[PDB]
Every structure is written in C-alpha cells, then in structure tokens.
Design a protein around this ligand. Structure first.
Ligand code: V8I
Ligand code: NI
Ligand code: ZN
Length: 263
C-alpha cells in the first residue's frame, strides 16, 4: 500500500497547485484562504466585537524568511492579545507578515465577492491555554489569524517604520532588530469582521486556524507597496527573483459557514 512522508514556494513548479503532494491536508475541508461571498455570509448577532489589546506589544525582530517578511513579538506574556470576536479565551500575538502581488490588482489571499486586494496583512496569534505556539500548532483551536486587506491610495503612516527598514532585509535569511513597533498603526478604523474555521495558508497548511478577516481595508501608498516588491525570494549571491505574488488562491469553502459580525 502507498506510504507518505524539494522546498515549496510560489513558482510554477513548486507553487500552491503542487503543495498537496507533500502536504495532502491541502485536499481537506478546512483550507484557507477562501472567497468571502457576502450574500452567503450570515450575519451572526451573537458574535462579540473583537477586543484587540496591543497596548504593550513588544516587537523584536524583522526578517526575510524567503517566502515573506515578518515582524516578531515577545509572546512570553499577555503584551499583545486578541480576545472576544468568535474566540474562546486569549490569543497572544507572535508575528505578523504580508502577502502581496506583482501589481496592485492582485496580492490578497482572501477575496471578497471575488475581488482581490493589493496585499493582505496577517497577525498570527496562539491560544494561551496550550502554553506555547508549538503546542498550540497541534490543536484545532490552536491559532487565530487577524487578516487585513491592503488597497493602494493614501500612505499608511503606521507602516512607514516597516517600509524604511526593508532595504536591510532584502534577501532570504536576513534579519534585523526591530523594536518599539506598534501594530495598532496597521489597523483600519472599523473592526467589523468575517470569521470561519480554516488553515495556515502556507505549508504545512494545518487545519487549526480561526480566521478573522476585517471588512475595512487599510490604504497604503503606491510607494510603500513598491518597497515590498523590491524584496527578494533568493539569498545574497543568488540570481535575483523578486518577492512578489506570495499568495495562495482561494480554496473551496466546502461545508463551512462564514459568519459576519455586522448586519
Ligand atoms: N498565512 S498564515 O496562515 O497566516 C500563517 C503563515 C505563517 C508563515 O509564516 O508562513 C505562519 Cl508561521 C503561520 C500562519 Cl497562521
Ligand atoms: Ni503502511
Ligand atoms: Zn499569511
């Protein structure tokens, strides 16, 4: 009988279309992202507003991991947490990262009534009742991701401290100290959201994520998102391959219901 055990990426040869070969959970019923069909999405008056408590958030480092860039946080205490919305309990912010396109007309992972945004911001949190992120990763209610759409318009002031250091992490494996960054400067004004049970959108595509996708996009300038597109998927000394189109497309919703926090 069959038995199951090159690196994944976003290229023709190793992109989303192929991930199912090493990560067969891609074939399952809880995969992210999804298209949010607003007609289908049922307003659920029993969802609470999302309580974002980032008042003490302690950023640590910023790094290029070869598939995105991310800002890490001290998650040893409840410095930056999510609760309420659809969540039971407290989730601690570990990291945020982005996905974006080669052009403004694509780049988001989630879509809304089939519309793609220019980019999507993901704030990754883990359920404190499991003690750390490695234990949480193993559970169905282990993680919560707050997803935020980016459109191109006016500059996002809170994003500028990030953009101003991207030249220091151009290539894979580069990182830098990145202290005193306030993630509140990346939120939109309204915290109205859609929620559904899903997965990581990157391998290993584990099905343990409560997704919270905000209705309202933030706007960033063309100049800012152009700075994203100057990152490299490659290492220093390797041929240049610009880090663009690092998004997985919408996956089948199957039997899941997406709920809205708003009428
Ligand atoms: N795209 S995602 O589903 O938010 C996600 C991405 C990553 C990643 O760094 O590749 C991680 Cl560790 C966790 C999550 Cl939850
Ligand atoms: Ni066997
Ligand atoms: Zn992500």
């Amino acid at each position: 009988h069959h038995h199951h055990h090159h690196h994944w990426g976003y290229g023709k040869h190793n992109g989303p279309e192929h991930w199912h070969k090493d990560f067969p959970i891609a074939k399952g019923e809880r995969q992210s992202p999804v298209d949010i069909d607003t007609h289908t999405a049922k307003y659920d008056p029993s969802l609470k507003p999302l309580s974002v408590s980032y008042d003490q958030a302690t950023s640590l480092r910023i790094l290029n991991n070869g598939h995105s860039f991310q800002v890490t946080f001290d998650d040893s205490q409840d410095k930056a947490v999510l609760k309420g919305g659809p969540l039971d309990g407290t989730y601690r912010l570990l990291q945020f990262h982005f996905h974006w396109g080669s052009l403004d007309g694509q780049g988001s992972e989630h879509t809304v009534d089939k519309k793609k945004y220019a980019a999507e911001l993901h704030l990754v949190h883990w359920n404190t009742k499991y003690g750390d992120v490695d234990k949480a990763l193993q559970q169905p209610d282990g993680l919560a991701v707050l997803g935020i759409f980016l459109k191109v318009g006016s500059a996002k002031p809170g994003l500028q401290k990030v953009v101003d250091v991207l030249d220091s992490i151009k290539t894979e494996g580069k990182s830098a100290d990145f202290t005193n960054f306030d993630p509140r400067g990346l939120l939109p004004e309204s915290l109205d959201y859609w929620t559904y049970p899903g997965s990581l959108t990157t391998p290993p595509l584990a099905e343990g994520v409560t997704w919270i996708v905000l209705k309202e996009p933030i706007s960033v300038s063309s100049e800012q998102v152009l700075k994203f597109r100057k990152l490299n998927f490659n290492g220093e000394g390797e041929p240049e391959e610009l880090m663009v189109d690092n998004w997985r497309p919408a996956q089948p919703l199957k039997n899941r219901q997406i709920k809205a926090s708003f009428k």
